[PDB]
Amino acid sequence: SVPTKLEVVAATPTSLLISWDAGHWWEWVTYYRITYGETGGNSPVQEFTVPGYSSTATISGLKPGVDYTITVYAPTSDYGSPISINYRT
Amino acid sequence: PTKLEVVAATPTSLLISWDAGHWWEWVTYYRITYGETGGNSPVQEFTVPGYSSTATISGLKPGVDYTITVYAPTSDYGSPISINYRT
Amino acid sequence: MAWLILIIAGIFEVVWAIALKYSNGFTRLIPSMITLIGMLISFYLLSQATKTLPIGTAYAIWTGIGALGAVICGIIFFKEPLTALRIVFMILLLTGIIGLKATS
Amino acid sequence: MAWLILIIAGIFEVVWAIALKYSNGFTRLIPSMITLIGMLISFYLLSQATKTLPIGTAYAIWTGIGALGAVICGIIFFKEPLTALRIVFMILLLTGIIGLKATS
Known part of the structure; x- marks a missing residue:
């Protein structure tokens, strides 16, 4: 049920500004956790978190031309499924 | 509190300290105000947690005589301590 | 005044209890x-x-x-069973509160 | 043993009441x-x-x-009133509280 509609608002060879749909006020969580990594097979992803009131997030320091997978998780598995996208910088 | 000293000082900032007492005299927060000794304005004021016995006043004009006071939460303690000091 | 503050504090007690x-x-x-x-x-x-x-x-x-507000809200907004036992307990609670405020 | 940690939680309740x-x-x-x-x-x-x-x-x-420890340690530490009316209405309030919590 949350979050919804993960998409890259803006993009640069090194950075991606992404956003999602937090849902209705009763669905808003206390924080989301975001995970970005090389879509290949190197498991040391990079991870950070974002306050539940924020619906956007910027992601700097990406190698130009690479294709990354980007995942947004709610605090618990209760609320829904984590959503993810692919993007080549 | 007591013993309001100016530990260190630069042209634009002071480091101040005070004696909290011990154990039972301690309070949860002190309130530090400061301003030009004369010239009206208002005074600036901030608040520090009561476990720290020091404070740092910053952004002062060099050469001016300021006055600094430290307050306990209420007057039912050890009265407000006050000093003057030129930067 | 201190009694009114107490009443409001209990109100907020039950509000944060349910919001939890x-x-x-x-x-x-x-x-x-x-x-x-x-x-x-x-x-x-x-x-x-x-x-x-x-x-x-x-x-x-x-x-x-x-507790009294917890039970009031539980009944009204949670379909909670209302016993006569619960009524006599609520009556005891209110009697205690009122008498304590009256012996100030 | 879970009973004992409940007793100890009830004691720390009185602890923070007196400290407050x-x-x-x-x-x-x-x-x-x-x-x-x-x-x-x-x-x-x-x-x-x-x-x-x-x-x-x-x-x-x-x-x-x-609550009982609060009342007792209050009449002890802070010489709070020990009237017959106060103990009576305190008994009523505490029994109402305990009953409403033993039900729900």
């Missing part, structure tokens, strides 16, 4: 926020009321308002 | 500090005993120890 369960693992924002706020208010007001009222009376009346 | 009284409206550090830590001990110790035990009996005994 409406939050999940402290993970639903709007509930959690209300819990955090309602707590901070409640206890603060308690700390104020305890300045002038005895700690036993203050704690007891604060707890009692919390 | 000593904090003079949350102004004297250390009582305030005892009030805050002793709180989340009691709140934590409870949730563990509440795991094993029925929530109703657990809450009843928890707030019973809390």
Whole structure:
């Protein structure tokens, strides 16, 4: 049920500004956790978190031309499924 | 509190300290105000947690005589301590 | 005044009590926020009321308002079973609170 | 043993009540500090005993120890009034509280 509609608002060879749909006020969580990594097979992803009131997030320091997978998780598995996208910088 | 000293000082900032007492005299927060000794304005004021016995006043004009006071939460303690000091 | 502060503190006691369960693992924002706020208010007001009222009376009346409002809200908004036992207990609670305020 | 940690949570309830009284409206550090830590001990110790035990009996005994110890340590430490009317209405309030919690 949350979050919804993960998409890259803006993009640069090194950075991606992404956003999602937090849902209705009763669905808003206390924080989301975001995970970005090389879509290949190197498991040391990079991870950070974002306050539940924020619906956007910027992601700097990406190698130009690479294709990354980007995942947004709610605090618990209760609320829904984590959503993810692919993007080549 | 007591013993309001100016530990260190630069042209634009002071480091101040005070004696909290011990154990039972301690309070949860002190309130530090400061301003030009004369010239009206208002005074600036901030608040520090009561476990720290020091404070740092910053952004002062060099050469001016300021006055600094430290307050306990209420007057039912050890009265407000006050000093003057030129930067 | 200190008694009015006590009443309001018990009110906020029950508000944060219900908002806590409406939050999940402290993970639903709007509930959690209300819990955090309602707590901070409640206890603060308690700390104020305890300045002038005895700690036993203050704690007891604060707890009692919390519980009485918890049962009122449970019945009204949660389809809770209303026993005659519960009615006599609510009556005892209100009698105690009123008599304690009347013996000031 | 879960009963014993419930008893100890009820004791820490009285602990933070007395410390809140000593904090003079949350102004004297250390009582305030005892009030805050002793709180989340009691709140934590409870949730563990509440795991094993029925929530109703657990809450009843928890707030019973809390309120009764508050009243007693109040008439002791702070020489709070020991009137027949006060003890009577305190009994009524505590029995109402304990009953409403033993039901729900």
